[PDB]
Design a protein around this ligand. Structure first.
Ligand code: HEM
Ligand code: HEM
Ligand SMILES: C[C@H](O)[C@H](O)[C@H]1CNc2nc(N)[nH]c(=O)c2N1
Ligand SMILES: C[C@H](O)[C@H](O)[C@H]1CNc2nc(N)[nH]c(=O)c2N1
Ligand SMILES: N=C(CS)NCCC[C@H](N)C(=O)O
Ligand SMILES: N=C(CS)NCCC[C@H](N)C(=O)O
Ligand SMILES: [Zn+2]
Lengths: 411, 407
C-alpha cells in the first residue's frame, strides 16, 4: 500500500511507503484520533525477534544484508540471548541505533542534523560518580564554547528492571523552582517537584530565580546521589533586546545547552533508561514556552507593562506584541554572544527540505504536526501547510515514568 | 476506553463518554495517525433515520413515547414506499444545530444553539435560490451586528437533481492570472473566477471584486447572479497607529458564509446548505492576508514599517503579522461589525468544552484546526488535549461541482 501527503502552499505531493515498517501503536483507532494527547522486565520470548529486526536493518544500511558477517552476528546474538537472556550491541550497532532513534523521532523538528550525532559510549559506567564524570564530559563537548555540537551519552542497558541507570533530572541543565508560602513561585514552576526532591536529598538551595539545579544520578538501581555541575561548564546568556534598553533590567537569562535526560532509548529490544542527549535551541522554546507559558516564568504581563501597551482588552493583541519582542530579544542575545540558536523560520524550512529528502531516499518521514508547528506564527512557517503522517518506528526514544514514582528506596 | 483529556496549563481533567456514540471513521488506524491530513439504498437509510430520531426524541424527553414510536413507524413506512423521507421542521432545526455542535474543526461552537435556520426546501429554481441567499445575507449581516444562520435547500434524491452553490463562500473576492505571471486579487479563487468569466461574467479585474453567485437548482446548469452591493458589508482596513496603513488599499467583507459543504441529517443529504457566523480576526489577518498562496502582503507591510528584512531571525514577519491583525480587529470594531479576536474565541471554546463535557459527556475537537494560526501557545486551547471523532448530524466536504457536473 501507498499513502499520499500534500503541502497546500506548494501543492507538492509525496508518497509514503515507510509506514509499512511501522510496528508499534499510535493510540488512535478507526473511530477516535488521539493526535493531540501528550502521552497516549522484558523476557527471552520477544527479545530475539526484536534483535533480528534491528540487525536486518543495520546490515541493510551497511549494504551487507545476507552476508556472512550478517548471518554470523544473528547467530551470535541468538546464542547470547539463550545463554544470558540478553545481549550486548557492538559499538557500530550502538551508534547506528542512537542516530536512528533521533531520525525516527516524529516530534523533533531538528532532524535534518540526525546523521551528525556524537555518540558517547558509557556502558562501562558502574557508579553515580562515574555518571557525573561522563555527563560533565558531555556538557563540555556539546557546549564547545558556544559552538554547539549534538551529542548523546549512553549508560548501561536495563537488565532485570531492578538495576536501572537513571538521570533523575528532566534536562541536564535546568533552573530550580520554589513554591512560596503565599502560593507564588520563585524560579521555574515546571521544576518545583524535582527541586523539592533535591533539597530533601541535601541540596543547599540558593533560592534565586535562576539557580542551576544539581544532578541527581542513579547507577545500577541504587539510591540517587547529588552532584553540582562545575559552573564554568554551564554556559548562560543574559537576555537583552536590541532596541529596548530596559529589557536587560528584567534580569532574564537562559542556559545555552538543552539536554533532555529523562527519556528511554530502545535499540533492538534493548532498553537504555539513561541516555541524555543534546542539540541546540530553537528560539521559541525559550522565548515562547519557557518565558511566556502561564505555568512557566510567565513574563508577558511585566514585559507588556514596560512597553506601555493597552493591556485592558485582549483585542489590542498586547500579548502577541510582547511575545514577538521577547523572542527577538532571545535570538539577539544568543547570536550576540555567539551561542548556537536557530529561529523558527529557518528551522521549519530546513525540516521541510529534510522531510522531502527522507521521502525520496527513505520512503517517508514520520512527523507529528502538533509538535512540529512552532508555538507562535504557525501559518507563516511552511510546516503549517504540510500534511504529515505520524507513526512509530524503532530504534526509538520513548517516555518513561519519573523515577521517584517507581524507585524502591534502599535507605 | 472511557477516555480522559487533560489541560496541561490548568491541570483540569475531563472524562469523555460521548465518543462511544461515534459512527463514521477518522482515517486513523492503530498504526498511523492522519490527524494533519486535510481531507481524510433503502436498507442503508432506515438505520440512519432511526439513530437520528432516537437522539431527537431523547433530546425532547420523549424517548420511548408513543409519539416517538409513531414517528419511527411513519418514517419507516415512508422510506419503504418512497425510498426516502422528509424531516419535520422541528427535526430539521435540531439536526442543523447539532451538525454545527458536532463540527470538530469549529472554534465558535459555544454559540451552537442560537442558529437561525431558514427552510428553503420549497425552492425549485436558481432564481429562487438567489432570493433565499439574498435574504440570508441580509438577515445574517444585520447592519454589522451579525447573526448566525443557515439556509437549507432541497435534499438529494437520486444525485442527478442536486442543488449546489458553486461558490465556496457566498462572498469572496475574484482572482486573476496576470500576463506578467503574477496574480491579481485572491489566488485561491483563480479557477472559480475563470469559470464565472467562462459563464459570461464581466470582471472589473480589480484587487477586491466581489464574485457573482453561480447557483445550481435541481441538477440544471448553474446560473450567475450579482449580490446587491448594498447587501455586501465591507470594512476598509486601517491601523490605529500607522497612518500609512490605509494607503495599502486593503478591505475585507464582514460575512463569512461557507457554501460548499454537505449537511447530513438522519441519512438525508443536503448538498446546498450555505451557513454563516462571524469572523475570528486571524482568519483574515493571518490566513487571507499573509499566506504565501493568498494575498501575501507580509513584505509590503514590513517595508512600510522599515523592518530589517535581511535575516529571518529579526522576526520581521512576526512583527508585521501582529500589526496587521491589530489593524483588522481595529477596523471591524471601529465600523461596528462583529469580529472576535483569537484570545477571546479560544477562551470561550474552553468554556464550551467544559459545558459539553458536563452536560453531554464530551466534545469532539480537532486540535490542528482549533489552535489559531498565530500565537498558538499563548491561547488556552494549545494546552488542551482534545479527542477527535465523528458524530452525526454532520457537515461534510463534497467535490467541487465543476469536476462532476454533466453539462
Ligand atoms: C540539533 C538541534 C535540535 C533542534 C533544533 C531540535 C528541536 C526540537 C524541538 C523544538 C522539539 C520540541 C521540544 C519541546 O517543545 O519540548 C524537539 C523534540 C525532540 N527532539 Fe529534537 N532538536 C534537536 C536535536 C535533537 C537531538 C540531538 C535529539 C536526540 C539525539 C533529538 C530528539 C528529540 C526527541 C526524542 C524529541 C521529542 C521530545 C518530547 O517528546 O518531549 N533532538 N526537538
Ligand atoms: C458564529 C461564529 C463562528 C466562529 C467564530 C467560527 C469559527 C470558525 C473557524 C475559525 C473555523 C476554521 C475555519 C478556517 O480556518 O477555514 C471554523 C470552521 C468551521 N465552522 Fe465555524 N465559526 C462560527 C460559526 C459557525 C456556524 C454558524 C457553523 C454552521 C452552522 C459553523 C461550522 C463550521 C464548520 C463545519 C467548520 C469546518 C470548516 C472546514 O472544514 O473547512 N461555524 N469555524
Ligand atoms: C495538548 C497538546 O498536545 C500539548 O499542549 C502539546 C502541543 N504541542 C506541543 N509542541 C511542542 N513542540 N511542545 C509541546 O510541549 C507541545 N505541547
Ligand atoms: C496541512 C494542515 O492540515 C493544514 O494546513 C491545516 C492546518 N490547520 C488548519 N486550521 C484551520 N483553522 N484552518 C486551516 O485551513 C488549517 N489548515
Ligand atoms: N531543543 C532540544 C534538543 S535537545 N530540546 C528540547 C527541549 C528543551 C525545552 N523545549 C526547553 O525549552 O527548555
Ligand atoms: N468563520 C466561519 C464561519 S462561516 N467560516 C470560516 C471560513 C472563512 C475563511 N476562514 C476566511 O477567512 O474567509
Ligand atoms: Zn490520529
Amino acid at each position: 500500500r501507498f499513502l499520499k501527503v500534500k503541502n497546500w502552499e506548494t501543492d507538492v505531493v509525496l508518497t509514503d511507503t515507510l509506514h509499512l515498517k511501522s510496528t508499534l501503536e499510535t493510540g488512535c483507532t478507526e473511530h477516535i484520533c488521539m493526535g493531540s494527547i501528550m502521552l497516549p522486565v522484558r523476557t527471552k520470548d520477544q527479545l530475539f525477534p526484536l534483535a533480528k529486526e534491528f540487525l536486518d536493518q543495520y546490515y541493510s544500511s551497511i549494504k551487507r544484508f545476507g552476508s556472512k558477517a550478517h548471518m554470523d552476528r544473528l547467530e551470535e546474538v541468538n546464542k547470547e540471548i539463550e545463554s544470558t537472556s540478553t545481549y550486548q550491541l557492538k559499538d557500530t550497532e550502538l551508534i547506528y541505533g542512537a542516530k536512528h532513534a533521533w531520525r525516527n523521532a516524529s516530534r523533533c523538528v531538528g532532524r535534518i542534523q540526525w546523521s551528525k550525532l556524537q555518540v558517547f559510549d558509557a556502558r562501562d559506567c558502574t557508579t553515580a560518580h562515574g555518571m557525573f564524570n561522563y555527563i560533565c564530559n558531555h556538557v563540555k563537548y556539546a557546549t564547545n564554547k558556544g559552538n554547539l555540537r549534538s551529542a548523546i551519552t549512553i549508560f548501561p542497558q536495563r537488565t532485570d528492571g531492578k538495576h536501572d541507570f537513571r538521570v533523575w533530572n528532566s534536562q541536564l541543565i535546568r533552573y530550580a523552582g520554589y513554591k512560596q508560602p503565599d502560593g507564588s513561585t520563585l524560579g521555574d514552576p515546571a521544576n518545583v517537584q524535582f527541586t523539592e526532591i533535591c533539597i530533601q536529598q541535601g541540596w543547599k538551595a540558593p533560592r534565586g530565580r535562576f539557580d542551576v539545579l544539581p544532578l541527581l544520578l542513579q547507577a545500577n538501581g541504587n539510591d540517587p546521589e547529588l552532584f553540582q555541575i562545575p559552573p564554568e561548564l554551564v554556559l548562560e546568556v543574559p537576555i537583552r533586546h536590541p532596541k529596548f534598553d530596559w529589557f536587560k533590567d528584567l534580569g532574564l537569562k537562559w542556559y545555552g545547552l538543552p539536554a533532555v535526560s529523562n527519556m528511554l532509548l530502545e535499540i533492538g529490544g534493548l532498553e537504555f533508561s539513561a541516555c541524555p542527549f543534546s542539540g541546540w535551541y530553537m528560539g521559541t522554546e525559550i522565548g515562547v514556552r519557557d518565558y511566556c507559558d502561564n505555568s512557566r516564568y510567565n513574563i508577558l504581563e511585566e514585559v507588556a507593562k514596560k512597553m506601555d501597551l493597552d493591556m485592558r482588552k485582549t483585542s489590542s493583541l498586547w500579548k502577541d506584541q510582547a511575545l514577538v519582542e521577547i523572542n527577538i530579544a532571545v535570538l539577539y542575545s544568543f547570536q550576540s554572544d555567539k551561542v548556537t540558536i536557530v529561529d523558527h523560520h529557518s528551522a521549519t524550512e530546513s525540516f521541510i527540505k529534510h522531510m522531502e529528502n527522507e521521502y525520496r531516499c527513505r520512503g517517508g518521514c514520520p512527523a507529528d504536526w502538533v509538535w512540529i508547528v512552532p508555538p507562535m506564527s504557525g501559518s507563516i512557517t511552511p510546516v503549517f501547510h504540510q500534511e504529515m503522517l505520524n507513526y512509530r518506528l524503532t530504534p526509538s526514544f520513548e517516555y518513561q515514568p519519573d523515577p521517584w514514582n517507581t524507585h524502591v528506596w534502599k535507605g
